[PDB]
Amino acid sequence: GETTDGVYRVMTRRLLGSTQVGVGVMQEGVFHTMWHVTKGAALRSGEGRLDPYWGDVKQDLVSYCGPWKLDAAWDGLSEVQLLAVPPGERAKNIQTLPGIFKTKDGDIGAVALDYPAGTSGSPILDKCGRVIGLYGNGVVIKNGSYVSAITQGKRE
Amino acid sequence: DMYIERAGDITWEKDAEVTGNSPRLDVALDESGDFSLVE
Ligand SMILES: CNc1ccc(-c2ccccc2C(=O)Nc2cnn(C)c2)cn1
């Protein structure tokens, strides 16, 4: 299949028409998405097959073809950009100062941008263009909007 | 069967739309990977 780095739509024909179920990141020959997008299923790229390599339902991450490659971190200070790929709409960058998820196991960056569920997996970038994590795992807030962690995996 | 389509390069863009707040939220993460609000 297509193995060029960049951001990809994840699609199914299992419903009416072609439906976008989420998004992911191709880096160093590895496809990166959220677990709730694919539920760990194999993916087609052209007539190529992408088989799952690593996943963790609790982290809500999954890699295809190789080990998680993405190792950059929110600095805790600087704005970031969601590279939102919404269903049927062009890739669009959205710049935002993340808030914080406070957890018993530590603080996580969080982004307060409301997009359809099929945007799940769009990358969050720093100022140098590095993927600091993925959008689409978080919480519906007092206001009814969705606030997403910045979800990052570990690189071995 | 799910398939992938390329949607763009991964690039920082100068003069992107700037929106969204920065809420500090108390949350818990369950074994199913669902976050929840802790008040
Ligand atoms: C009507 N309720 C909701 C709830 C979540 C979302 C949403 C918004 C942005 C990005 C992802 C999601 C989302 O669905 N995330 C998710 C994580 N795990 N699962 C199983 C689903 C939208 N509307």
HEC sequence for chain B:
CEEEEEEECCCCCCCCEECCCCCEEEEEECCCCCEEECC
Residue A84 identity (one-letter amino acid): A
The response to whether residue A153 sits with its C-beta less than 6 Å from ligand 1 reads no
Nearest Cα residue to atom 12 of ligand 1: A117
Q: Is A38 exposed, middle or buried (0-12, 13-18, 19+ CB in 10 A)?
A: buried
Topology match between the domains A6-64 and A80-149: yes
CB contact under 8 A, A58 and B4: no
Give alpha helix (H) positions in chain A: 35-38
Token pair, residue B11, equals 């690039």
Paired residues of A58 in beta bridges? none
Backbone angles phi, psi at A106, to 5 degrees: 135, 170
Q: Please tell me the CATH superfamily of domain A80-149, with its number.
A: Trypsin-like serine proteases (2.40.10.10)
**Dihedrals phi, psi of A61, to nearest 5 degrees:** -120, 160
Chain A hits for B29, Cβ within 8 Å? 58, 103, 105
Tokens encoding A40? 């760990």
Q: 3-state class of A43 per DSSP?
A: strand
Question: Quick check: A112 and B23 in contact, CB under 8 A?
Answer: yes
Q: CA A113, CA A62: separation in Å to the nearest integer?
A: 23
A32 is catalytic: no
Quick one: fold of A6-64?
Thrombin, subunit H (2.40.10)
Asked if A111 is an interface residue toward chain B (Cβ–Cβ < 8 A), one would say yes
Place of tokens 């945007």: A119
Residue A120 CB–ligand 1 contact under 6 Å: yes
The answer to whether A43 contacts chain B (CB < 8 Å) is: yes
Enumerate the domain spans of chain A: 6-64, 80-149
A2–B4: do the CB atoms touch at under 8 Å? Answer: yes
Residue of A nearest to B6 (CA): A8
The DSSP secondary-structure symbol of A47 reads T
A152, containing H or E segment: none
Q: Does B25 touch chain A (CB under 8 A)?
A: yes
Beta carbons of A110 and A96 less than 8 angstroms apart: no
Catalytic residue selected from A32, A63, A120, A148 = A120
Gyration radius of chain A over CA positions? 15
Resolution of the experimental model, in Å, one decimal: 1.5
The residues near A114 (Cβ < 8 Å, ≥ 6 apart) are: A145, A146
Residues 6+ apart with CB under 8 A from A5: A26, A27, A28, B9, B10
